[PDB]
Amino acid sequence: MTIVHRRLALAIGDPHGIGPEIALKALQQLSATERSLIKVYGPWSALEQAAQICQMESLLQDLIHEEAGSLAQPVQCGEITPQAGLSTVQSATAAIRACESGEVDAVIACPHHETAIHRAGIAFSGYPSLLANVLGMNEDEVFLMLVGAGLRIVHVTLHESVRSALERLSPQLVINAVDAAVQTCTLLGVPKPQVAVFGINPHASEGQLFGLEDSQITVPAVETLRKRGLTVDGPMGADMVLAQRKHDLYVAMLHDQGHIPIKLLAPNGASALSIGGRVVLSSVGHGSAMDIAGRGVADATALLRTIALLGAQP
Amino acid sequence: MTIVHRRLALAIGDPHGIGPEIALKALQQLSATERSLIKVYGPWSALEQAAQICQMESLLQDLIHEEAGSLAQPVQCGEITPQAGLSTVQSATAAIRACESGEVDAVIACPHHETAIHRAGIAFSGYPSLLANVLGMNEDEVFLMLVGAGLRIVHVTLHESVRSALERLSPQLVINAVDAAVQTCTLLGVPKPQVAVFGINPHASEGQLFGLEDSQITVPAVETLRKRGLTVDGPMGADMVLAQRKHDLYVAMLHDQGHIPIKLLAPNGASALSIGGRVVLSSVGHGSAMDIAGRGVADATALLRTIALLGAQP
Ligand SMILES: [Mg+2]
Ligand code: NA
Ligand code: NA
Ligand SMILES: [Zn+2]
Ligand SMILES: [Zn+2]
């Protein structure tokens, strides 16, 4: 039962958290063929540490690895340290640049601890932002696509107030997001997807009865996309379209429009993809779990589910 | 097996559609005790017509009835006529005023035909609005509660642009809506409900990182409601709370926040409650079905499900 059909970069996240642990446990479960498609980015010391704990010493030899985020002192399982914050970022930075340059086709990032990163002096508002910085893009040109229960919902805005989101929406922004998410769909194994665009306002404005935004923003975006030769329905009322369940990719205007479906239908088995240039970075949708770090009791299910998704055949 | 534990007004909707039929079929299935709790509002001629068709003449004597929406000519099963549009409205107007004055505790409206009403010259944008007009209230003082798959979600705003909705939210507005919906919960048979309030902004603002609205609007509303002695969690990120599924009443700020959960999880089996000034009005959630009007193929299940909900025991 083979889940990895392409080259992937795995960055092991906070070297003090469960990242290293779950990395190894997840490579354990693969055939050797599959393991050699996964390049691991992170400090060797932490993978040593997690191996002695998990009793997986055999698997270090049979592992493709690039040193990133090296440590100047021994690993301290469970401690929040400025150093470990830097490791995380360097490791993730490394894997992204191997995707950017084409050594791999996507990145998976193991958990971070935000305190550790802040304490290192690094601005971090998530993987959308980090991914932008590293690539030299604007933060509004990288987007978040959630994937769970077969719904793929890309978000035009994310993690700002509604108002701020509203005063940023534009025909161009929607277009960029759909383009990013369609190139991503090809990676996920839906090369030619049928897209549905959510309305900004309820019922997609209902012409212009419930506001003018849709007529100014979504409708002109949809026309452009169709002309470029994409199959694209809408704008339609978010509630209505999601119920039909007849699309491969939904496009949401506001955070909640996309996050409510996903976390309702797949509250732990969802994946969060950051999409920018040709880089698709997914998180493993759990924290660094410092409380259990180094006790070898951390589950890799989420990491395997994430690999299965970005490692997909079509 | 008794589903009606209080006094209800049943308005028979379009007197040409299946309303009359399903009314009678639905009263058929009740005990006589339960039938005397249900006052029927509509033209007698149409209930006569539907009774001769269905062969239920015995049940007209055993029926509490108030003439509303009288017709000046014989009933025409299946025809869209200006007259029948007026009947619907008069009947529904009547039942609401019997709730308003306290003769009954809630109203159920059988199906309407929008064309018929428009052709009579009457503005109708739904039961929220009609209920406002009849009661002499502002349309933002009536609130919509959707009910389906166990979720009860009251909406603070509804059927206006996000922006307009945003610039109307205020501590008082939230409070009004929760009060209305908690009174309604008592009718629905959850006297002492555990409430969750959705954030305006993603993640309920995250302190004030994602905007100030929540700190100005939802937090001050929640504090007030707790002090009045209500069990009330939040504000919380809509996506997060709905996933826990640990509450009897959710409170949504924007239309979509509430309508996406419902239509996704119960695209067929759901109820829309309009709430204002002691009145709870539900529809039956199917159209008037003119093509089978008088042809005795219409089942009353949806009408009975609606009665079971508004007729619930304390
Ligand atoms: Mg708006
Ligand atoms: Na993130
Ligand atoms: Na107000
Ligand atoms: Zn989020
Ligand atoms: Zn609606």
- Token pair listed for B269: 């089996």
**SS3 state of residue B245:** coil
Give the closest of A163, A254, A257 to B211, CB-based. Answer: A163
3-state SS of A235-287?
EECHHHHHHHCCCCEEEECCHHHHHHHHHHHCCCCCEEEEEECCEEEEECCCC
Q: Are B26 and B300 in contact (CB under 8 A)?
A: yes
Residue A127 Ramachandran class (φ > 0 left, ψ -120 to 50 alpha, else beta) = alpha
Contact B247, B234 (CB under 8 A): no
Residues of A in contact with B161 (CB under 8 A): 200-202, 205, 210-213
- Chain B residues with CB within 8 Å of chain A CB: 158-164, 166, 200-203, 205, 210-213, 237-240, 242-243, 254-257, 259-265, 267
Contact B46, B133 (CB under 8 A): no
How far does the centroid of ligand 2 lie from the alpha carbon of residue A276, in Å? 14
Strand B106-109 versus strand B271-276 pairing type: unpaired
Nearest CB among A202, A243, A262 relative to B256 is that of A202
| Contact yes or no for B183/B176 (Cβ under 8 A) | no
Euclidean distance between CA atoms B112 and A192, whole angstroms: 42
Phi, psi of A37 (to 5 degrees): -85, -10
How many beta-carbon pairs under 8 angstroms link A with B? Answer: 113
Reduced to 3 states (helix: H, G, I; strand: E, B; else coil), residue B194 is coil
d(CA B73, CA A32): 84
Pick out the residues of the known binding site of B for 3,4-dihydroxybenzoate.
127, 159, 203, 259, 263
Q: Rounded to whole angstroms, how far apart are CA atoms B221 and B51?
A: 51
**DSSP calls for chain A:** -----S-EEEE---TTTTHHHHHHHHHHTS-HHHHTTEEEEE-HHHHHHHHHHHT-GGGGTT-EEEE-S--SS---TT---HHHHHHHHHHHHHHHHHHHHTS-SEEEE----HHHHHHTT---S-HHHHHHHHHT--TTTSEEEEEETTEEEEESS-SS-HHHHHTT--HHHHHHHHHHHHHHHHHHT-SS--EEEEPSSGGGGGTTTT-SHHHHHHHHHHHHHHHTT--EEEEE-HHHHHHH---SEEEESSHHHHHHHHHHH-SSS-EEEEEETTEEEEE-SS---GGGTTSS----HHHHHHHHHHT---
Minimum CA–CA partner of B167 in chain A:
A163
This structure's resolution (angstroms)?
2.7
Minimal Cα–Cα distance from B165 to chain A, Å?
10
CA angle A76, A77, A79 (to 5 degrees): 70
Rg of chain B over CA atoms, in angstroms? 20
Q: CA-CA distances (angstroms) from residue B123 to A167, A281, B89, B115?
A: 33, 52, 10, 11
Give the residue carrying structure tokens 């509604």. A162
In this structure, are residues B78 and B294 in contact, taking their beta carbons and an 8 Å threshold? Answer: yes
Q: Are B152 and B247 in contact (CB under 8 A)?
A: no
Residue B73, number of CB atoms within 10 A of its CB: 8
Which residues does a chain break follow in chain A (C to N more than 2.5 Å)?
none
Which of B156, B209, B239 to probe the A interface (max A CBs under 10 A)? B239
Q: Looking at chain A, which residue has its C-alpha nearest residue B267?
A: A243
The answer to whether residues A254 and A157 touch, using CB atoms and an 8 Å cutoff, is: yes
Distance A166 CA to ligand 1 centre (A): 7
Closest ligand, as measured to the CA of A259 = 4
**Measured torsion, CA atoms of residues B166, B169, B174, B180, in degrees rounded to the nearest 10:** -90
B210, B211, B243 member nearest A263 (Cβ): B243
Instruction: For the beta carbon of residue A312, count every other beta carbon within 10 angstroms.
Output: 16
Q: Strands across the sheet with B143-148, in order?
A: B64-67, B38-42, B8-11, B106-109, B279-283, B271-276, B143-148, B151-155, B249-252, B195-198, B232-236
CB distance B65 to B16 below 8 Å: no
CA distance A25 to A9: 16
**In sequence order, what are the residues at sequence separation of 6 or more whose Cβ sits closer than 8 angstroms to the Cβ of residue B39?**
B7, B8, B9, B10, B64, B65, B66, B95, B98, B103, B104
Give CA separation, B244 vs A131, A266, B19, B132, B237, in Å: 31, 12, 39, 34, 11
> What is the token pair recorded at B55?
């062969």
DSSP B57-96: THHHHT-EEEE-S--SS---TT---HHHHHHHHHHHHHHH
Which residue in B159, B203, B211 is closest to A202 by CB distance?
B159
Domains and their CATH numbers in chain B: 8-137+277-310 (3.40.718.10), 143-265 (3.40.718.10)
Nearest to A130 by CA among A160, A86, A161, A188: A86
Method: X-ray
How many angstroms separate the CA atoms of B102 and B97, rounded? 8
Q: How far is the CA of A202 from the centre of ligand 5 (A)?
A: 7
Place of tokens 């993730």: A92
Find all residues with CB under 8 Å of B217, minimum gap 6, and list them. Answer: B169, B170, B171, B174, B200
CB B51, CB B40: distance < 8 Å: no
Distance A73 CA to ligand 2 centre (A): 28
φ, ψ (nearest 5 deg) of residue A175:
-60, -50
